[PDB]
Amino acid sequence: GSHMEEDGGIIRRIQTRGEGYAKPNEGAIVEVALEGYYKDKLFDQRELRFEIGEGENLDLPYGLERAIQRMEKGEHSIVYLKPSYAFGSVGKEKFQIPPNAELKYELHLKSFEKAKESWEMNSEEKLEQSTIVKERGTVYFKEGKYKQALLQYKKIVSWLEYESSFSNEEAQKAQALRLASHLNLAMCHLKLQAFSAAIESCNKALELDSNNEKGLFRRGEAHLAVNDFELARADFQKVLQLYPNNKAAKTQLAVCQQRIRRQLAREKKLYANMFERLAEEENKA
């Protein structure tokens, strides 16, 4: 292996060795002491405890994560990031780091719990962890951290995706988890103004409930957000049929009707005038 042929974009010096037997991997709960400089000026001082791959939402250069993913237990060192592996072109305000800049990072990796890989865990474990993760996805969400919530609910769809050595009991326990995941994803996306993704998640979910109140609903909100009135009308009109006493379904269904007839009226008068104009133009003989 020994990938690292990012041509020294990411380089570290083991200031202080430190026991260690294994390294932090994808999605691992890392506890770390951070010190990063530009030119030689300090912009970041703090001891963050985050999940690897979560760094983007925590003002940390892409490169800094792959570096950490190559440390010991209580190891110390420093990372020198070439422009392409740290805020790069977009630079980074609130730290005012001009585009195409380099960085210096002095990081001390304390503890860390590696993220179990799909292969490592048997049927039940996947279900347990699928739970542990969702719990988090839940917190991050009610906390307004939608992107990080995404990170969580996804791990679930991942782990449970292939593996099917599930007893009929776990088969549906896991299916519930999946459905839950997809519904929650759609929820985040809508928050994130990512309506295409919202709709793709509703579909993955309705492939599991095709009657689901939330999926059918959330998909109507997404169509409606991007002026997909007709498609929306369809989803709200259907949610009502399956759940008459559904609050927003009725109102939203109304919005569609409104926007649709006004739309109709508009495009009607157009052809009307377009028609007239052709006539007069045709009369020219």
């Binding site: 839940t138 839950a180 519904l183 929650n184 609050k247 927003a248």
Partner: peptide, 5 residues
């Protein structure tokens, strides 16, 4: 749990 609405 999932609520809100």
């Amino acid at each position: 749990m999932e609520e809100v609405d």
